Amino acid sequence: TLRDEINAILQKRIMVLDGGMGTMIQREKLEEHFRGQEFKDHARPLKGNNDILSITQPDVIYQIHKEYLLADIIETNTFSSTSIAQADYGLEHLAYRMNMCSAGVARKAAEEVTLQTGIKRFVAGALGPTNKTLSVSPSVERPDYRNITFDELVEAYQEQAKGLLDGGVDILLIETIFDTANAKAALFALQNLFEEKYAPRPIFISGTIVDKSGRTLSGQTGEGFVISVSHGEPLCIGLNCALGAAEMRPFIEIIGKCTTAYVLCYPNAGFAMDGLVNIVGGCCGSTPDHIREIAEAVKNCKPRVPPATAFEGHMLLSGLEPFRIGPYTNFVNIGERCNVAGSRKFAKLIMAGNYEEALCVAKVQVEMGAQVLDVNMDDGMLDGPSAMTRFCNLIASEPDIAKVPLCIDSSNFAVIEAGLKCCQGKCIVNSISLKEGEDDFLEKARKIKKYGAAMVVMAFDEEGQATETDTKIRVCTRAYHLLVKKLGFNPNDIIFDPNILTIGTGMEEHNLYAINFIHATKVIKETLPGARISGGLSNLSFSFRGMEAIREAMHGVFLYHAIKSGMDMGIVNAGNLPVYDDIHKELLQLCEDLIWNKDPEATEKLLRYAQ
């Protein structure tokens, strides 16, 4: 494969990527007339559309490539060769052919330099960002609204991809990523083609930081960015344009310590690294005369040593900023309040269409200790997919809320699927189960892996809801086997939810429920390596609604033990979780008896505690 030959050269020498072609074409000093012969009577002006020059001025583009190759990896002249971008020139219908030609003219140059020079050259298929932003609204007036959709972007990128691959490119390069959701759509397009039609080529992914803040246009940090696109298994990852080498330095060394991939990096004008870069090039301002200076400098430099064990046993999530759950990370609070069924206010504000004030419920939860936000829009009086889509897009607007990862909560996979399309960072999916059999579970788990989300697996199968310690273990053990073995799902992306069910009901059947969850948590944490444990905590205490002090006390008493058994996270009321040591010793001991069913009349004695 090309990956072998690619990784081989990279392990020995730091490769070079060509400068931006736009600078050279600008120097060429075209005129509208010069695009071209073929068109002649085109109703839209083509001047400035560098992409069509592959057809209308091929020799010019070919010579641009040659200069760089002699002065190497060559980008295809395909930065705007999508349906979306070419609509501004009335060439929507021409995307595939433009990429095909752009890849041919580049491939002809590559091989001449390969013949004359002796060393092999590579063609990079450039996929660009388009002007559409899937994570940012066109205006602050309507923050729910979006111009393009995920599926619309996937279609376009898929078509561009076909052309490049057919045109015989050696690397697909998703570059100048202003918005990460676009890049995720591009990655989804590439996975579509590879799944059956094509043999996979290596993917290079380059972000674009705008300021000294270290953030993308879509507000995301480098660390958050790599997590959001790691599922694409890119051979190389980096940054390009917008910033010079000096401004763009400290972000690269952050990115490099967070990934096993090689590190691309091609800055701009208005530089030998310290083990920071694996591939080097230029963008706006870079000429072939620059690349020569870059080439002679990097000639004898020792390439970066990628860490092959970077965040090995961590669950990687991301909002705008990264959020990692390693073995020694403490209990992660996933905020419960943004749930139409489980919250009185939230439901009233969603059903009444007041989404702007509903964001305050998300904002306050994060301020009150919520590290992930659970979003649940399930109600018979709601259009699930749209409301999720709407609320997710609104959250993205508010930077305080958007920082954290999101937990997409629905009993309907189409709602799940809608939220994933609208989320820029890596989310938790909540949930799937074996309720409808193995094949259905696998199809849904196969789709989630494709979007690249973490995932909650409910302790539910064909028999129904798992309420016993053994039944809980059975389902999770079977599930773990299907995910890890049959699908190659990363076991660190698997959360299992043995079901936290109500106790204290006055029905002896429900008495062991808490214990079973804690016991099952132990065996699962020991049985199934990598997987983590979650649970909806407030379900435990439906029996004592009204008495909040008891509910909160129950939660704290429950957690203390659960956490000891191996509970990594939960869907909880983040502000209102007392510390185990500061809970009154009488109430603590009472709840301890209820959770562990040690006292036969534990129910009445708890409700007795009020007074």
Ligand X SMILES: Nc1nc2c(c(=O)[nH]1)N[C@@H](CNc1ccc(C(=O)N[C@@H](CCC(=O)O)C(=O)O)cc1)CN2
CA angle 329, 334, 336 (to 5 degrees): 160
Q: If binding is defined by CB under 6 A, does position 342 make contact with ligand X?
A: yes
Structure tokens at 273: 């690294």
Per CB under 6 A, contacts with ligand X among 519-558 are: 535-536, 538-539, 542, 545
Q: How far apart are CA 499 and CA 517, in angstroms?
A: 7
Cα 509 from Cα 505, distance rounded (Å) = 9
Inter-CA distances, 130 with 134, 153, 224, 482, 552, Å: 10, 9, 21, 38, 49
Residues 360 and 400: their CA atoms lie apart, in Å, by 10
Site for ligand X in 279-308 (CB under 6 A): none
User: How far, in Å, CA of 322 to CA of 243, rounded?
Assistant: 22
Cβ proximity to ligand X: between 454 and 456 the closer is 456
Q: Is 99 known as a binding-site position?
A: no
- Of 302 and 545, which CB lies nearer to ligand X in the complex structure? 545
d(CA 469, CA 489): 25
Nearer residue to ligand X within complex by CB, 137 or 467: 467
Q: How many residues bind ligand X (CB under 6 A)?
A: 19
Least distance (Å) from ligand X to the CB of residue 356?
20
Residue carrying structure tokens 């001025």: 57
The alpha-carbon radius of gyration of the chain (Å, integer) is 27
Residue labelled with tokens 């009154």: 584
Positions in 312-341 near ligand X (CB under 6 A)? 336, 339
Binding letters toward ligand X, positions 408-447, x by CB under 6 A: -x--------------------xx----------------
Helix (H) or strand (E) holding 521: helix 513-527
Known binding residue 301? Answer is: no
Tell how far CA 224 is from the center of its chain.
8
Sign of CA dihedral 305, 74, 268, 157: negative
Choose which of 33, 344, 485, 585 interacts with ligand X (CB under 6 A): 344
Q: CA angle 357-361-366, nearest 5°? A: 135
Q: To the nearest whole angstrom, how small is the minimum distance from the Cβ of residue 485 to ligand X? A: 23
Confirm or deny that 497 is annotated as ligand binding: yes
Assess contact for 217 and 178: CB atoms under 8 A.
yes
Q: Is 344 annotated as a binding residue?
A: yes
37 touches 56 (CB < 8 A):
yes
CB of 106 to ligand X, least distance (A): 49
Q: Per the annotation, does 409 bind a ligand? A: yes
CB of 153 to ligand X, least distance (A): 30
| 342 labelled binding-site residue | yes
Q: Which of 500, 518, 587, 594 binds ligand X (CB under 6 A)?
A: 500
Q: CB of 489: closest distance to ligand X in angstroms?
A: 18
Does position 490 bind ligand X by CB under 6 A?
no
Binding residues: 241, 283-284, 342-344, 409, 430, 497, 539, 545, 551
Binding residues for Zn(2+): 241, 283-284
- Residues lying near ligand X in the complex (CB under 6 A) are found at 336, 339, 342-344, 409, 430-431, 456, 497, 499-500, 535-536, 538-539, 542, 545, 571
Binding residues for (6S)-5,6,7,8-tetrahydrofolate: 342-344, 409, 430, 497, 539, 545, 551
